[PDB]
């Protein structure tokens, strides 16, 4: 696991000793105390039961019965009974008319064509209440927490009864983004990226297909007559159109529609009267390799995991100059430290605009790395 | 309403030639084009023959392919069937029926009601 | 492209449920089935378009349905007048019409 340091609990007169810690995804943080056994904080996972549905965006359509209507040139002008109907597309265009095809006299003939409109694959699109986030803490005793119910309380051997108020801060800011789901992958994308898509959606209370013609385009009419241009599935265009966006595991202990990804959560743990212990660390200045580069999550942030062979409990010193060593490249990862040697530690970084130059090391065995950066 | 208006009774002996008549009414005829079916007595439906309006391109069964010829004709508004030299099992009631104009699974009528015209009564026989 | 149209003859008596099998050859999404109705002496009345659309004024209880490579015309309750031969015709992206080979229902005793 992982020690606290000194100034992370305090030990008062009367009452108890608070630690306020930051747990992220996969770390623990242990707490220690002499004469009594250590303790292990694991958070398992923080995840969400079963978002509310928004919209259905349809990217592959089935265009079928199609029937039209013809009237001559200046004899009024056609109408079908589909054009009413939630199940087709219709479309208003002119055919050239004349003594051949048995119209009374020449001009532009109006012709009425419809299309029913049945969607095949339709991607969803879910939004996050933010306040039902659900996130578990493993401290073996099982805790699990909503962004509503931040103190949850559990008395364990050794410690007395334990009151842990705690906090989630989330990753993407669910205020604006939305959660689509394709056949079997997942995505987090933008809620007006998805608005202002040129697919049909169906509404939320069922609806209908609104806004089909952006999938649904007729060939110019002859006589008398359409041919259906049956603009395939644009799956093609989405999944390329998805590429530079934030996924999002489906599940894979807890349910179906329990869907997981990382973040941020912060607590505070109310213990007895107790004289807790201190554990500090230096810094990582030996020999140290990449294990996964330096790649992006999608949301600006950089993620690079590293390993450290030699003098394993420190923490890494990660700098983003602008070179030389001053650094305007915010940290994200809280405690970068090695739980043990041969090990592998994960660093969430946000560097700046345009391009920086990450550092790893100090003097000698220094791990370097560049990264453009042109969000928008 | 909406119907298709055939021929009347023919007889003919043995290798001659029969046209049969069917004057749509009450759609557009452009589209729509206009298949053919006949019946035995006793036996079941075969189809025999289609034509179209727009695109004039025909097709054949292939048993009558050497002896059918369908014409049609816009301004009339009627669609014909020629029938070649009549063996003795040619005697039968044959139909005119509305069909899609293309048969390419979406262009025009592809899901439509078939109307059906009245009865040729051909008797053939020395 | 080849159809089977099962049973042959039918013998149920008024009241009864019935149920006509025009297996096709392939069920495709273009694929075109009409039933029809043939009383001994008289021109086929079409019942059912596409494959479950009733026809202009067909009564309420002739109803089709597809699933499969077989296709199925379902009558709720038989009636004196519905004891006649039923066809089923097919095409699909093809100008030739396949018509089935006869379903004749007729009063058991």
């Known amino acids: 696991c992982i020690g606290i340091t000194d100034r992370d609990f305090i030990e008062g007169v009367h009452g108890g000793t608070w630690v306020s810690a930051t747990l992220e995804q996969d770390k623990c943080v242990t707490v220690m105390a002499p004469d009594k056994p250590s303790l292990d904080i694991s958070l398992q996972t923080v995840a969400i039961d079963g978002p509310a549905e928004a919209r259905k965006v349809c990217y592959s359509a089935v265009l079928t019965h199609v029937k039209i209507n013809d009237k001559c040139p200046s004899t009024g002008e056609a109408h079908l009974a589909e054009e009413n109907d939630g199940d087709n597309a219709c479309k208003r265009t002119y055919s050239d008319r004349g003594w051949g095809n048995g119209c009374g006299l020449f001009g532009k003939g109006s012709i009425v064509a419809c299309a029913k409109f049945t969607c095949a694959k339709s991607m969803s699109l879910f939004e996050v209440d933010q306040t039902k986030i659900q996130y578990v803490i493993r401290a073996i005793k099982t805790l699990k927490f909503d962004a509503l119910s931040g103190s949850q309380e559990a008395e364990f051997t050794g410690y007395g009864k334990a009151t842990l108020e705690c906090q989630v801060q989330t990753a993407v800011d669910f205020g604006n983004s939305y959660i689509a789901e394709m056949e079997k992958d997942s995505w987090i994308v933008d809620r007006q990226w998805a608005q202002d898509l040129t697919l049909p959606w169906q509404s939320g209370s069922g609806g209908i297909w609104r806004e089909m013609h952006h999938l649904v385009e007729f060939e110019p009419p002859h006589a008398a007559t359409i041919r259906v241009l049956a603009l395939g599935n644009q799956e093609g265009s989405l999944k390329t159109a998805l590429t530079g966006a934030m996924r999002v595991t489906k599940d894979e202990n807890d349910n179906n529609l329990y869907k997981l990804h990382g973040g941020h959560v912060s607590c505070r743990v109310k213990l007895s009267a107790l004289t807790l212990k201190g554990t500090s660390y230096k810094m990582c200045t030996d020999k140290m390799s990449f294990v996964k580069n330096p790649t992006d999550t999608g949301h600006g942030t950089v993620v690079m995991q590293v390993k450290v062979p030699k003098g394993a409990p420190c923490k890494i010193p990660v700098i983003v100059a602008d070179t030389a060593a001053v650094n305007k490249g915010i940290l994200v990862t809280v405690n970068p430290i090695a739980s043990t040697n041969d090990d592998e530690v994960l660093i969430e970084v946000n560097p700046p605009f345009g391009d920086s130059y990450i550092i790893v090391g100090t003097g000698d065995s220094r791990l370097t790395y560049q990264w453009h950066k042109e969000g928008s | 309403q909406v119907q298709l208006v055939q021929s009347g009774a023919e007889v003919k002996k043995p290798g001659a030639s029969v046209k049969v008549s069917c004057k749509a009414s009450?759609?557009?005829?452009?589209?729509?084009?206009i298949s053919w079916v006949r019946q035995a007595p006793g036996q079941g439906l075969e189809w025999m023959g289609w034509?179209?309006?727009?695109?004039?391109?025909?097709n054949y069964a292939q048993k009558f392919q050497g002896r059918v010829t369908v014409t049609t004709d816009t301004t009339t508004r009627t669609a014909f069937m020629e029938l070649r030299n009549l063996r003795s099992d040619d005697t039968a009631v044959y139909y005119c029926?509305?069909?899609?104009?293309?048969?390419?699974?979406?262009?025009?009528?592809?899901?439509?009601?078939?109307?059906w015209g009245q009865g040729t009564l051909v008797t053939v026989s020395s | 492209i080849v159809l089977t149209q099962s049973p042959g003859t039918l013998s149920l008596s008024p009241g009864e449920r019935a149920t006509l099998s025009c297996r096709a050859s392939?069920?495709?999404?273009?694929?075109?089935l009409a039933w029809y109705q043939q009383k001994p002496g008289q021109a086929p009345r079409l019942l059912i378009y596409?494959?479950?659309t009733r026809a202009t004024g067909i009564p309420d209880r002739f109803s089709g349905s597809g699933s499969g490579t077989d296709f199925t015309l379902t009558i709720s309750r038989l009636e004196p007048e519905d004891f006649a031969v039923y066809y089923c015709?097919?095409?699909?992206?093809?100008?030739?019409?396949?018509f089935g080979q006869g379903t004749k229902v007729e009063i058991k005793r």
């Open positions: 034509i179209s309006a727009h695109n004039g391109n025909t």
């Open positions: 015709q097919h095409y699909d992206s093809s100008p030739p019409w396949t």
């Open positions: 029926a509305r069909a899609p104009w293309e048969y390419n699974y979406r262009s025009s009528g592809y899901y439509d009601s078939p109307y």
């Open positions: 392939q069920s495709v999404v273009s694929t075109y």
């Open positions: 009450g759609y557009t005829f452009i589209a729509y084009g």
């Open positions: 596409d494959t479950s």
